[PDB]
Amino acid sequence: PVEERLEYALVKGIEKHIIEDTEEARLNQKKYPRPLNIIEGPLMNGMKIVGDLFGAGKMFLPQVIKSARVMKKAVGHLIPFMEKEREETRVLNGTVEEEDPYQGTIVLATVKGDVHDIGKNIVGVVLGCNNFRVIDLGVMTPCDKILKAALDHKADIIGLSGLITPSLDEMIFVAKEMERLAIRIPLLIGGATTSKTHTAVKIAPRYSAPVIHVLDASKSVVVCSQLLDENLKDEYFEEIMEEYEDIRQDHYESLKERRYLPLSQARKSGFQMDWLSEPHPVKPTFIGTQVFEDYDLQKLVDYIDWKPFFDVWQLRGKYPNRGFPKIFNDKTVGGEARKVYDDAHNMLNTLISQKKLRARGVVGFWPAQSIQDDIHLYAEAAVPQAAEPIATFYGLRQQAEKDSASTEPYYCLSDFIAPLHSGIRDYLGLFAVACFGVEELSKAYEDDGDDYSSIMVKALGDRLAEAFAEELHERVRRELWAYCGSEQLDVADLRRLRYKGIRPAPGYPSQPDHTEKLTMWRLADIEQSTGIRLTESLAMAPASAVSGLYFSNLKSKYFAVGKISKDQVEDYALRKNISVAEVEKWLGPILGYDTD
Ligand code: B12
Numbered sequence: 375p376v377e378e379r380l381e382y383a384l385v386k387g388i389e390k391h392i393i394e395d396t397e398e399a400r401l402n403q404k405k406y407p408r409p410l411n412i413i414e415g416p417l418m419n420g421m422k423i424v425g426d427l428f429g430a431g432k433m434f435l436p437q438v439i440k441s442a443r444v445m446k447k448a449v450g451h452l453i454p455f456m457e458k459e460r461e462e463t464r465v466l467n468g469t470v471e472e473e474d475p476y477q478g479t480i481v482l483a484t485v486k487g488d489v490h491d492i493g494k495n496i497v498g499v500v501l502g503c504n505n506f507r508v509i510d511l512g513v514m515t516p517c518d519k520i521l522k523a524a525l526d527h528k529a530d531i532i533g534l535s536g537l538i539t540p541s542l543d544e545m546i547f548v549a550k551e552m553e554r555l556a557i558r559i560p561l562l563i564g565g566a567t568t569s570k571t572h573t574a575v576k577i578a579p580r581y582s583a584p585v586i587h588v589l590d591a592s593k594s595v596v597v598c599s600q601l602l603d604e605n606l607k608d609e610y611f612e613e614i615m616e617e618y619e620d621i622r623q624d625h626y627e628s629l630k631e632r633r634y635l636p637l638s639q640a641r642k643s644g645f646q647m648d649w650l651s652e653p654h655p656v657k658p659t660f661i662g663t664q665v666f667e668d669y670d671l672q673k674l675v676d677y678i679d680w681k682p683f684f685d686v687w688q689l690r691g692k693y694p695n696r697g698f699p700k701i702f703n704d705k706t707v708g709g710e711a712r713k714v715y716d717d718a719h720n721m722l723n724t725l726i727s728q729k730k731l732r733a734r735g736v737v738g739f740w741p742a743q744s745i746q747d748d749i750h751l752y753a754e755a756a757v758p759q760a761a762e763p764i765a766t767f768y769g770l771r772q773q774a775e776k777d778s779a780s781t782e783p784y785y786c787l788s789d790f791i792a793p794l795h796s797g798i799r800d801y802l803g804l805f806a807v808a809c810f811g812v813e814e815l816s817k818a819y820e821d822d823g824d825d826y827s828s829i830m831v832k833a834l835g836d837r838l839a840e841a842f843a844e845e846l847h848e849r850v851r852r853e854l855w856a857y858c859g860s861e862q863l864d865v866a867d868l869r870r871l872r873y874k875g876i877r878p879a880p881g882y883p884s885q886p887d888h889t890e891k892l893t894m895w896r897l898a899d900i901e902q903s904t905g906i907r908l909t910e911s912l913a914m915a916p917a918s919a920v921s922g923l924y925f926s927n928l929k930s931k932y933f934a935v936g937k938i939s940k941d942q943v944e945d946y947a948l949r950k951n952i953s954v955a956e957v958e959k960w961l962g963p964i965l966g967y968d969t970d
Contacts, residue, residue: 384420387440487911585601937966
């Protein structure tokens with residue numbers, strides 16, 4: 375029989391004879407009077423088997439993508455006959471019937487200002503494997519375009535993705551706009567920057583229709599099936615409503631229960647250094663920017679941290695095999711991890727040897743001094759105490775009250791730079807790297823129909839950007855700044871943060887203000903030197919880009935600012951010479967007080 379062959383090819387992921395079997399079944403008009411039967415019947419049966427096996431955890435994500443590719447080739451062979459049948463019937467009967475076999479239509483988009491779509495692509499493929507008609511809209515999607523896509527495609531669900539905290543404001547804007555046209559379509563929320571608490575507190579109240587946060591792609595199928603089943607729709611919505619009300623009440627009680635120090639008191643208990651006895655800062659080999667136009671990708675292959683790459687494919691090894699290279703020894707996901715790693719190495723070799731990917735970056739150093747909570751940068755030949763700063767990076771100090779038994783100070787990034795009045799020269803660095811050509815390769819793979827290769831190339835581009843950042847930080851410590859000239863740590867120690875100094879990035883918990891990237895881009899001329907541009911929400915395009923600041927102090931360390939009070943917001947607005955509303959917008963996730 376041909377149905378068994380179709381199901382076996384779908385489940386196992388064999389495109390070798392899928393065209394032949396599909397054509398053979400199509401020619402068997404006895405079983406299938408219309409080609410819709412080959413879709414509604416044997417083909418979606420294998421897709422459903424794959425989807426439920428993935429939901430149960432027996433089959434892993436890469437095999438799901440293989441099955442999706444096989445199904446895509448099958449439907450691609452079938453769609454000319456679908457078009458022929460529809461064109462014939464439009465003239466024979468004058469009408470087009472409801473021939474939809476999918477469970478529902480879902481508009482899937484990444485909100486404006488965000489350029490990350492690996493998770494959105496994975497979610498779309500997973501949903502498509504469960505007979506959902508996924509409508510992927512891309513990145514930096516305007517809200518009006520999402521609403522128009524939902525209206526034109528008679529969509530049933532809308533999904534929003536976002537990776538940076540400025541995307542949360544866009545998501546809330548989309549929710550309230552959906553409310554403004556009185557749309558009743560359920561709205562799912564996903565992304566690395568999203569959380570269950572933020573959705574119920576901020577996103578959920580703005581929309582009357584269901585708004586559900588989804589942690590991963592596996593839960594997305596369950597949520598969509600429950601939302602599209604009328605026997606479970608209202609009860610699931612009510613349960614979501616009660617749990618979100620409970621979490622909102624708990625959130626407000628907590629917010630009443632937190633204590634914060636006064637800003638002056640927090641400053642008085644900040645981190646201190648003995649600059650009169652600590653070793654003096656090491657002057658960099660140059661003051662200004664050194665631009666890299668075409669970095670050696672082969673040097674970046676051995677600097678790649680593969681654990682986030684295996685986290686992309688959801689191949690999470692159990693203890694003690696939870697990380698590379700021990701993941702290959704795991705009983706369950708060892709074979710799939712090995713297959714994915716081999717494919718990644720093959721594609722990396724092909725792209726590097728063909729010059730299909732280019733890495734560009736810039737690193738700069740300037741004299742820097744500290745004035746309370748700010749780091750001021752000066753010219754090369756200018757005396758810091760008698761010259762105007764050419765740039766300033768404003769820091770945020772931890773304000774949340776700590777445990778009485780705790781003795782840790784209240785950290786700020788300016789604590790790692792020598793104060794101006796101390797009479798000690800100090801310097802600060804910054805960098806920005808990227809991997810160029812991932813977008814075109816992903817588009818080419820998606821046009822062919824290989825979503826697996828597109829996801830692989832996106833993950834490899836991100837890995838290459840991270841490896842470039844790590845290697846450049848290694849060079850800065852030993853060669854360009856030479857404050858750690860005796861460093862000889864291996865890449866394993868590099869991934870363990872065992873070296874001197876730190877490289878905080880804007881938007882991270884050390885300094886969660888994304889507007890710090892504008893100063894770097896204006897100072898180091900990053901967009902003109904390397905081609906990396908900031909979007910409207912201060913995200914780096916291409917998405918395979920990493921930036922940050924270089925702190926060479928021995929005592930410097932990574933810290934989380936946490937929640938801050940109103941007074942720190944007012945002081946930050948006064949220092950930055952911007953309105954309080956802008957500070958609250960760019961520091962919304964770290965506000966310890968309500969704003970509405
Ligand atoms: C490696 C990594 C990167 C990658 C991002 C990977 C990518 N492009 O997908 C890169 C190298 C680009 C990077 C850069 C930066 N990152 Co980053 N990064 C990480 C990290 C460690 C991995 C998370 C991740 O992306 N996994 C990959 C995908 C598969 O996971 P996911 O997006 O969560 O997708 C899943 C689910 O969320 C869900 N899902 C996703 N979308 C949708 C949509 C719908 C509808 C549904 C139903 C489900 C759904 O399904 C997916 C499958 O599981 C996280 C830490 C963390 N724990 O989240 C930080 C994190 C996401 N990074 C963040 C930040 C700070 C940045 C930067 C701004 C820092 C910088 N260099 O300036 C830049 C971004 C600018 C840029 N580069 O263009 C923040 C978030 C923003 C913030 N705090 O303001 C995080 C959370 C770190 C942090 N603690 O602050 N980073």
